[PDB]
Amino acid sequence: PVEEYLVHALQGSVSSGQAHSLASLAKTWSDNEGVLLTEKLKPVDYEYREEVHWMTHQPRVGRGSFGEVHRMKDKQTGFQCAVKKVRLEVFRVEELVACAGLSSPRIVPLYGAVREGPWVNIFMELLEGGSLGQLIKQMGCLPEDRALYYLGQALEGLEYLHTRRILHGDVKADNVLLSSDGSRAALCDFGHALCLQSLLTGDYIPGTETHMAPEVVMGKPCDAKVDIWSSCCMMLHMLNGCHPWTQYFRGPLCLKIASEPPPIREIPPSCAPLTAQAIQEGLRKEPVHRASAMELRRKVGKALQEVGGLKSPWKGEYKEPR
Numbered sequence: 427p428v429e430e431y432l433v434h435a436l437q438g439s440v441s442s443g444q445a446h447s448l449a450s451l452a453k454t455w456s457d458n459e460g461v462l463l464t465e466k467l468k469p470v471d472y473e474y475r476e477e478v479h480w481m482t483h484q485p486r487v488g489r490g491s492f493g494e495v496h497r498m499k500d501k502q503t504g505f506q507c508a509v510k511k512v513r514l515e516v517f518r519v520e521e522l523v524a525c526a527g528l529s530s531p532r533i534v535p536l537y538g539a540v541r542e543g544p545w546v547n548i549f550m551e552l553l554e555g556g557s558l559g560q561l562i563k564q565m566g567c568l569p570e571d572r573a574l575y576y577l578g579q580a581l582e583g584l585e586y587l588h589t590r591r592i593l594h595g596d597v598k599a600d601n602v603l604l605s606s607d608g609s610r611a612a613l614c615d616f617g618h619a620l621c622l623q624s625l626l627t628g629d630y631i632p633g634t635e636t637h638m639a640p641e642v643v644m645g646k647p648c649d650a651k652v653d654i655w656s657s658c659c660m661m662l663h664m665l666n667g668c669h670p671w672t673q674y675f676r677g678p679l680c681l682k683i684a685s686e687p688p689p690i691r692e693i694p695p696s697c698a699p700l701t702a703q704a705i706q707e708g709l710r711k712e713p714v715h716r717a718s719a720m721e722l723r724r725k726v727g728k729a730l731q732e733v734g735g736l737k738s739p740w741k742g743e744y745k746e747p748r
């Protein structure tokens with residue numbers, strides 16, 4: 427009843443506020459409005475404006491697929507964090523509604539969101555350890571124990587999301603961000619995020635093709651499990667130093683995912699029995715037979731123990747891809 431009036435109060439201003447306010451306001455985003463969820467990012471006289479109240483680093487780098495994430499500093503508090511720019515016309519509400527209010531070490535925290543013209547600027551914690559995606563290029567591929575250690579942590583994050591009926595929609599090494607020392611990993615980029623109970627309808631944006639599940643490619647309905655398929659495509663990416671299918675095929679990798687059997691052949695034979703079996707559960711074509719996050723996280727935990735826990739260093743010597 428009063429919801430109408432609360433939305434109006436938030437509009438036209440940037441305020442220090444709370445996740446529930448941000449979600450309400452964000453829904454209006456299909457001149458300077460927004461909510462900041464942390465003390466460290468303060469608006470000034472109802473405003474928070476690029477190059478006035480917050481400065482993007484003048485060296486200027488570009489993280490993310492579209493060079494859309496940047497290092498930034500709030501001019502007054504001097505607090506540093508990251509900003510994802512989303513085009514306003516493309517902006518999907520779920521990216522925040524999923525992300526907002528979430529408290530978990532396996533998820534990158536949201537610090538707020540502010541609209542300014544054709545942009546939505548989404549603020550978040552800065553992780554200086556880079557992406558798992560960068561780690562793989564850097565070190566070619568990863569050792570079995572490291573690989574399991576991280577997949578487990580990704581799976582821990584997916585549990586959290588699925589308990590709240592949220593689908594990440596694009597699980598992939600690029601979207602797993604590491605800490606300074608590399609002991610902790612967290613999921614980021616909820617730009618394909620959905621709420622749960624068909625998939626292919628209208629304003630929906632699809633994930634990475636190589637990491638895409640069969641039910642999605644074909645078009646059957648989808649559940650939490652589509653993330654599980656991706657997470658294991660990512661497992662393989664960590665082990666072999668390249669995405670599945672790419673080594674074996676050139677033209678349209680989608681039709682290959684549907685017709686061909688799961689790419690379990692890409693599991694290096696030198697993996698332990700359980701490591702291989704865990705991945706096999708995760709990549710079963712049919713969601714009903716495929717494992718859930720809870721089931722796979724448990725199996726992955728076991729496989730790590732089975733190879734004597736996390737031995738190998740965080741910056742081991744480069745290993746050759748397959």
Ligand SMILES: CN1C=C[C@@](O)(C#Cc2ccnc(-n3nc(C(N)=O)c4cc(F)ccc43)c2)C1=O
Nearest residue numbers: 489490508548550551552553556557614615616
């Ligand atoms: C909480 N939250 C708010 C917006 C969000 O949906 C995102 C994202 C995203 C997309 C691509 N890339 C990165 N990305 N961020 C960082 C960083 N925080 O330092 C980063 C660092 C890299 F090295 C590479 C990509 C990176 C982050 C989201 O999840």
